Amino acid sequence: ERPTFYRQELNKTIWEVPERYQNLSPVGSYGSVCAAFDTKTGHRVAVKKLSRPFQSIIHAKRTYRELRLLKHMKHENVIGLLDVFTPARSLEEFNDVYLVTHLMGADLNNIVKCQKLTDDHVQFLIYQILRGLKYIHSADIIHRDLKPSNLAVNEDCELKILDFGLAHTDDEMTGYVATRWYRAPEIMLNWMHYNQTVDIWSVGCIMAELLTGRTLFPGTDHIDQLKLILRLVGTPGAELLKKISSESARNYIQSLAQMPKMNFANVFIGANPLAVDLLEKMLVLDSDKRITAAQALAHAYFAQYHDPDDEPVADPYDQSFESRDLLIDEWKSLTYDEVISFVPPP
Ligand SMILES: COC(=O)Nc1cccc(NC(=O)OC)c1
Ligand SMILES: [Cl-]
Ligand SMILES: [Cl-]
Ligand SMILES: [Cl-]
Ligand SMILES: [Cl-]
Ligand SMILES: [Cl-]
Ligand SMILES: [Mg+2]
Structure with a gap:
């Protein structure tokens, strides 16, 4: 044997x-x-x-x-x-x-920086990430480290998720570093106990970058990154403030001047309107209100690929x-x- x-x-x-x-x-x-x-x-x-x-x-x-x-x-x-x-x-x-x-072989970086992506390519790539996440989340597993270098892609545009977060150091998350640009704000700043919704924030950051060719929130440090995030999605209201457990963190947020959510059609200029709609449902500050992977698979943006009889759970x-x-x-x-x-x- x-x-x-x-x-x-x-x-x-x-x-x-x-x-x-x-x-x-x-x-x-x-x-x-x-x-x-x-x-x-x-x-x-x-x-x-x-x-x-x-x-x-x-x-x-x-x-x-x-x-x-x-x-x-x-x-x-x-x-x-x-x-x-x-x-x-x-x-x-x-x-x-x-x-x-x-x-x-190649990861999503080796394509995002070096290829011309059609909307059909973005549909297929994000569909496959969400199909894998529906499976992962059904077993109450949280990936925690979704980013382009952790997504393998081949010549037929087929994708696999890898390098699960097995619990990163403080040094690795400091400064102008891609290790932090895809992280949800509630885990980047330890606002609250996090859950599987952190992975959906990451998918939104990845999808935006495929559409524009540019990093969505390339902050030079934690606070610069938070300011970029709040300028796009708006400052929090009292409902989300209730859910932040640290008094200092709540005090810090309330020191910032209030800002409205921006018009995403004027940010993602020329994008498929259904892609803009899906981004608005992923990039929500309150994690309770983000779309789930199972819900996103049924969104009209993926009508060409969605097959509810071939999206299995774990x-x-x-x-x-x-x-x-x-x-x-x-x-x-x-x-x-x-x-x-x-x-x-x-
Ligand atoms: C800072 O400029 C922006 O507001 N938006 C931007 C920048 C670069 C590319 C795209 N492309 C896009 O949206 O393709 C669908 C959009
Ligand atoms: Cl041994
Ligand atoms: Cl088991
Ligand atoms: Cl990366
Ligand atoms: Cl495999
Ligand atoms: Cl104000
Ligand atoms: Mg990796």
């Missing part, structure tokens, strides 16, 4: 992998990644060797979290898990984890481990069980 493994040192790293994976070639370095040819399936694949997966309780729980999430995702518009392996023959010598996925996903307190070796044993129970797709 156990395959034969072979060892090799590539760029100061030891890689021990099953014989099926050939012609390993480093491509990036969290973990290190190699491209390879999988002789069992015929696919070009990415093989990621996790870096120090069990060095702390926090790191061991993050390793388990990532493996549980990747094993669950089975949808055309979401990255899935092709294989997971360890060279260890027992729990006692278990130390290294390797994850195998389809090798992705199997239920048990996240009870997140509130559980365990020792490093217990998280490590749970991870080992998940490695050895993996069953590959058809």
Whole structure:
């Protein structure tokens, strides 16, 4: 049952992998990644060797979290898990984890900056993001880090969501950085407990950029970005102010001069009127009032692509481990069980 493994040192790293994976070639370095040819399936694949997966309780729980999430995702518009392996023959010598996925080429950046997009292209790309999100949200999963570099696109305009937020540092979110330009205001400034509606804000930011070729809210810091957002969508009323839990944050908002919501047809000049209408329903300051992924799929902007018999939901996903307190070796044993129970797709 156990395959034969072979060892090799590539760029100061030891890689021990099953014989099926050939012609390993480093491509990036969290973990290190190699491209390879999988002789069992015929696919070009990415093989990621996790870096120090069990060095702390926090790191061991993050390793388990990532493996549980990747094993669950089975949808055309979401990255899935092709294989997971360890060279260890027992729990006692278990130390290294390797994850195998389809090798992705271009991301949405490699097209948004370098192609001329028709409205039909925007329809199809945003449709696929929303189709994947309906699936993800049905399992009570929040992606949290949707942005163009986390969307893989091929030559036929087919799209997959990847790089789920596994819980970014303070430094990474500081200044003039794309890591923050797509984040909902309530999570950027920790206004309140957030939920899956944060992902819909991100989709609105992405759709605007596909239509205009420009970043929607390219703030130089958190406060500059908030000012760009409030100039477009308006300052909050008392109803949303009630829902912001920090007194200082409420005090800060009330120090700003009030502004009305702008006319989106005069911002997205020349855009399909149905695209303008959908943007107005995603880019709503109060997260309770944003359109959901399931509701957006039925919007008339997608009439050409919507098929309610081919927009599936996910199997239920048990996240009870997140509130559980365990020792490093217990998280490590749970991870080992998940490695050895993996069953590959058809
Ligand atoms: C700051 O200028 C704007 O207000 N709007 C803008 C800028 C650049 C491109 C587009 N394009 C667009 O809307 O295509 C549908 C719109
Ligand atoms: Cl996949
Ligand atoms: Cl090992
Ligand atoms: Cl990006
Ligand atoms: Cl005022
Ligand atoms: Cl589950
Ligand atoms: Mg990424």
